[PDB]
């Protein structure tokens with residue numbers, strides 16, 4: 001009894017004591033056997049949602065309508081779900097029927113309270129071989145829920161299994177069925193897929209299967225998805241870093257409409273574009289300017305250098321370290337640190353408030369950051385006063 | 396900082412550090428002030444669902460569509476919700492706007508990370524006075540969401556506050572609007588209502604307001620709901636015990652269609668009926684038979700005696716204790732313990748399998764339970780053999 005299951009045992013044990021019968025199901029079982037770090041623990045049972053909610057003190061009703069109830073047990077959330085047959089939903093008492101309806105054999109294993117693997121579909125066998133194979137007829141399953149095809153690919157990215165020959169074939173043959181699946185759902189698969197350790201060969205697969213060109217903005221980018229195999233994807237440590245690089249590798253022109261079409265939240269779309277733009281604007285790591293670094297703020301500069309690294313092969317290590325150093329010597333680090341205020345500039349220049357003020361303050365921060373003048377009132381004043389009779393001597 | 400809020404502080408503190416601003420809202424603030432045991436802590440914030448989900452490691456998406464996200468923090472689930480204006484939903488940045496849309500002034504208080512009470516609608520006053528008053532126009536609020544009326548009454552039951560004269564008036568004037576609210580939602584209110592410490596006066600209230608007779612099966616039971624005031628409701632310790640007694644007190648004829656019309660889950664409807672039935676079959680605590688006790692199993696017998704107690708005024712103490720004792724001396728406690736098997740009876744009586752076998756086994760368990768014969772094979776055999784030549788001497 002490995003620690004992730006050890007603590008979830010309470011749940012099974014209690015469902016059993018009320019005469020129910022429950023099992024560990026899902027990736028966690030897969031992971032355990034595969035030797036992976038264990039993902040998160042799910043419990044399937046013969047108990048119906050209102051029974052689960054009656055037995056355990058804290059329960060969250062996530063979706064009891066399709067069998068699932070969240071149980072908070074000794075401090076964590078677990079998803080407990082009644083055994084079901086995938087049509088509205090029908091509940092049963094057969095664990096075997098509940099496994100039959102699961103996507104791939106690896107995912108279709110179960111473990112009992114005593115640690116016994118129950119594996120009626122040869123998932124264990126598929127794990128030894130490292131194969132993603134559909135439970136039952138590859139074709140039928142994908143018709144039932146086209147999204148399964150997407151998962152199959154991401155699983156390739158996540159575990160470096162290979163697609164079974166006939167399962168793969170089914171995908172190309174059943175590609176179209178995707179555009180019936182709501183974007184949101186595809187996005188979370190894509191995101192996982194990009195963060196796969198094997199992302200490097202999952203992107204190409206996205207092309208050699210029919211899946212490309214039913215995914216948003218991946219219309220005929222087949223050439224592009226193949227050359228993607230050369231990108232050092234796994235050093236991307238962040239969501240934005242990922243999307244950014246995806247764009248860069250697909251030669252995406254305007255980041256905004258694309259990342260939007262994927263229904264990613266605004267802040268991510270923005271930040272990804274930010275990185276992307278910075279990267280167009282700084283073509284070499286030495287090229288960073290106090291200005292642009294200040295402008296970008298340490299984090300994003302770092303991400304830029306990481307995304308660059310994932311494209312070049314040059315580890316970001318040394319740059320990240322110089323950026324960290326530079327940033328911490330920037331005479332000011334935010335605009336709010338500026339020792340001088342918009343209203344000061346007004347009193348000094350005898351001009352009424354307006355759009356010239358921004359321009360002033362802008363020229364000032366830059367001058368402070370470039371260290372042309374200290375961040376102190378008296379010295380900016382002189383600086384500004386003297387630079388206003390220079391604009392007179394020029395035109 | 397009381398312990399319920401102490402641990403939730405983290406959530407606020409983090410939302411604030413990302414520059415958001417969040418408050419403790421809801422019953423828990425009310426509870427705190429009223430001096431009650433604190434119900435469960437909720438957080439309202441200016442941050443949007445996707446921000447909350449971004450900041451906190453474990454999050455459950457219960458309903459981000461209307462602003463709510465559950466955050467698992469240091470081992471508990473908390474409901475975090477973006478400030479909103481009740482129409483689709485509009486998110487704002489005003490805490491004041493978010494409180495304005497809540498049901499009653501007691502429920503519309505707020506507390507900040509430093510323990511400051513923010514109370515723009517005089518909830519604090521309404522607590523001092525012990526009054527349920529609508530936030531804003533009593534009439535308008537009930538039109539917006541008729542369920543509010545139900546809550547007001549259950550809160551009466553839960554806190555012993557009185558309804559404000561004009562709020563009450565609004566209920567009678569706006570009673571009809573209930574039949575637009577789905578039963579399920581009324582059921583959970585009713586259930587709380589029945590388990591109030593003041594249930595004794597909430598049920599009558601249900602009648603003196605127009606609410607009665609838009610609640611299922613409470614058509615013109617006005618007379619009955621008033622006399623309900625005399626029932627010792629607060630000793631009912633269980634859901635079934637409650638419904639049971641509610642039936643008994645409404646003179647409900649057939650338990651089953653009634654409890655069903657309330658959409659309670661089946662096991663409850665069943666068990667309630669069980670208790671109710673046993674109660675019609677045993678009119679005095681002394682009257683319990685080894686038979687009927689064995690037939691009911693300790694739990695239910697106890698529940699019967701408690702439901703009786705709530706109707707009579709005689710404390711169930713002594714009976715509960717004798718039942719516990721009797722049940723633990725029942726020669727067998729389940730039908731499975733019987734020392735003799737259906738197939739034994741066939742071999743013994745030379746008759747083919749069939750419906751007479753049940754009848755035999757039935758007569759046997761009863762005889763064991765009544766202690767007419769030991770629960771042992773050899774002795775049941777004789778008992779049965781000798782009782783089969785008695786049915787010959789009789790007809």
Ligand SMILES: Nc1ncnc2c1ncn2[C@@H]1O[C@H](COP(=O)(O)OP(=O)(O)OP(=O)(O)O)[C@@H](O)[C@H]1O
Nearest residue numbers: 025026027028039040101102103107108145147148
């Ligand atoms: N689209 C689907 N069709 C059939 N079964 C599915 C589908 N999606 C999920 N499942 C089943 O339920 C589980 C889904 O859980 P989930 O997708 O969270 O984790 P997992 O696939 O097991 O691994 P991971 O934790 O990495 O995501 C799978 O184990 C599989 O049994």
Ligand SMILES: Nc1ncnc2c1ncn2[C@@H]1O[C@H](COP(=O)(O)OP(=O)(O)OP(=O)(O)O)[C@@H](O)[C@H]1O
Nearest residue numbers: 420421422423434435496497498502503540542543
């Ligand atoms: N129908 C409604 N109309 C307006 N506001 C509501 C409504 N239902 C709930 N609320 C608001 O949200 C909170 C709902 O919390 P909830 O019903 O869970 O607990 P509570 O009423 O505050 O007290 P308790 O924990 O005992 O139930 C209330 O405090 C109130 O602010």
Ligand SMILES: [Mg+2]
Nearest residue numbers: 026027039040
């Ligand atoms: Mg999983």
Ligand SMILES: [Mg+2]
Nearest residue numbers: 040041076077
């Ligand atoms: Mg978990």
Ligand SMILES: [Mg+2]
Nearest residue numbers: 421422434435
């Ligand atoms: Mg509450």
Ligand SMILES: [Mg+2]
Nearest residue numbers: 435436471472
């Ligand atoms: Mg809580």
